[PDB]
């Protein structure tokens, strides 16, 4: 029993080299062939690109106002059961939590994604949204494997300020012993898409899981989208995260 997935803020609001960058992301999906893809900052022409160049993935969306999140399900592997949209009532950037209940490899899952409140100034709202996500993860039925993968925009001690991760929720990067090779997902030194002159390295993209003891645990975690495209830029200002969870008995 296993699940492989990619989480990626694909910077859809960047109108520069968007078809080439979308091609780049679809090439990654074809190469790594994940069961599920969690995407953030998707825009309408980006969906149209995914429909043609990643046609074997069912695109699940909630609200599609401006830019939004999506959960892609591999056709034939993942069976869609239901979707739930959890609002962030105090969001100023139309952010929300999207859960998609699915069946995969004989196991039941609630796959969640969000793009938590952006900007340093809205730290208090981002922390409240993280609490909502963590609360929803704990509320899922006991026999279901809960996976959150998204752009949290988290930094410093914001997780500590939220009250920390609960006793039954784990960060995949933390669980694997905080490996250095995938410690930053938003790196202005290694990534040139935004042309930020200052060197900034943050871990905005995070994976949280809630699984039964002795069942699914992270096997691997790797950065994706580190290959420069023909235009000399990367598919996004963010690196994507490729993760596999496996059962260890
Ligand atoms: N350009 C640029 C630029 C350069 C350097 C940094 C450095 C940090 C840092 O060491 N810690 C941190 O928590 N955030 C940093 N951001 C950041 C990243 C996203 C958003 C906002 C932000 N939004 N609104 N105001 N600031 C700041 C940067 C951004
Ligand atoms: Mg962006």
Please name the residue that has the structure tokens 């930020």.
196
Start-end of H helices in 59-110: none
Active site residue 151: yes
11 annotated to bind ligand: yes
- Is 91:112 a contact under the CB 8 Å cutoff? no
Domain that holds residue 51: 1-249
According to DSSP H, which parts of 10-151 are helical? 18-32, 44-53, 123-139
Task: Please indicate if the annotation marks 205 as binding a ligand.
Answer: no
* Cα distances (angstroms) measured from residue 56 to each of 25, 46, 77: 14, 16, 10
Determine the atom of ligand 1 nearest the C-alpha atom of 197: 4
* Integer angstrom CA distances of residue 104 from 53, 76, 107: 23, 9, 5
* 233 three-class SS: coil
CATH number of the structural domain spanning residue 31 = 3.60.10.10
φ/ψ of residue 172, rounded to 5: -60, -40
Nearest ligand to residue 66 Cα: 2
How many Å lie between the centroid of ligand 2 and the Cα of residue 93? 13
Strand partners, 246: 2, 217
Residues 159 and 130 sit within 8 Å (Cβ to Cβ): yes
Angle at 132 between CA 126 and CA 134, to 5 degrees: 100
Q: Is the CB of 155 under 6 A from ligand 1?
A: yes
Distance 196 CA to ligand 1 centre (A): 10
Contact 110/144 with Cβ under 8 angstroms?
Answer: yes
Structure tokens that stand for 115 in this block: 């793009």
Whether 93 lines ligand 1, by a CB cut-off of 6 Å, is: no
Residue 22's SS3 state is helix
Method: X-ray
Task: Say if CB 46 and CB 12 are below 8 A apart.
Answer: yes
Q: Of all protein residues, whose CA lies closest to atom 28 belonging to ligand 1?
A: 200
Choose among 214, 172, 229, 213: nearest CA to 6: 172
Q: How far apart are CA 75 and CA 72, in angstroms?
A: 9
Q: Where are the alpha helices (DSSP H) in the chain?
A: 18-32, 44-53, 123-139, 158-162, 172-175
- Is there a contact between 62 and 98 (Cβ–Cβ < 8 Å)? yes
Given 14, 35, 142, 151, the catalytic residue: 151
Looking at the DSSP bridge assignments, the partners of residue 187 are 201
Count of structural domains within the chain? 1
Instruction: Name the residue among 139, 120, 12, 25 with its Cα closest to residue 72.
Output: 25
Around ion ligand 2, which residues have CB less than 5 A away? 11, 13, 41
């Amino acid at each position: 029993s296993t699940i492989s997935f990619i989480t990626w803020n694909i910077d859809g609001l960047d109108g520069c080299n968007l078809p080439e960058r979308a091609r780049g992301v679809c090439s990654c999906l074809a190469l790594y062939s994940p069961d599920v893809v969690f995407l953030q900052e998707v825009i309408p022409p980006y969906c149209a690109y995914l429909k043609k160049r990643a046609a074997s993935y069912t695109i699940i969306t909630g609200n599609e106002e401006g830019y939004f999140t999506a959960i892609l399900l591999k056709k034939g592997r993942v069976k869609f059961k239901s979707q739930e949209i959890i609002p962030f009532p105090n969001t100023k950037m139309m952010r929300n939590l999207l859960c998609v209940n699915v069946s995969l490899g004989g196991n039941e899952f609630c796959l969640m994604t969000s793009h938590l409140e952006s900007t340093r100034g809205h730290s208090a709202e981002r922390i409240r949204q993280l609490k909502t996500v963590l609360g929803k993860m704990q509320e899922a039925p006991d026999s279901t494997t809960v996976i959150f993968a998204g752009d949290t925009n988290l930094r410093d001690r914001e997780v500590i300020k939220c009250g920390g991760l609960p006793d039954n929720v784990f960060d995949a990067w933390e669980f694997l012993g905080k490996p250095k090779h995938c410690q930053y997902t938003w790196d202005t030194k290694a990534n040139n898409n935004l042309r930020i002159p200052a060197a900034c390295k943050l871990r905005f993209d995070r994976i949280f899981f809630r699984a039964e003891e002795g069942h699914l645990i992270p096997q691997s975690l790797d950065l994706v989208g580190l290959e420069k495209l023909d235009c000399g830029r990367f598919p996004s200002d963010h690196w994507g995260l490729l993760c596999t969870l496996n059962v260890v008995l």
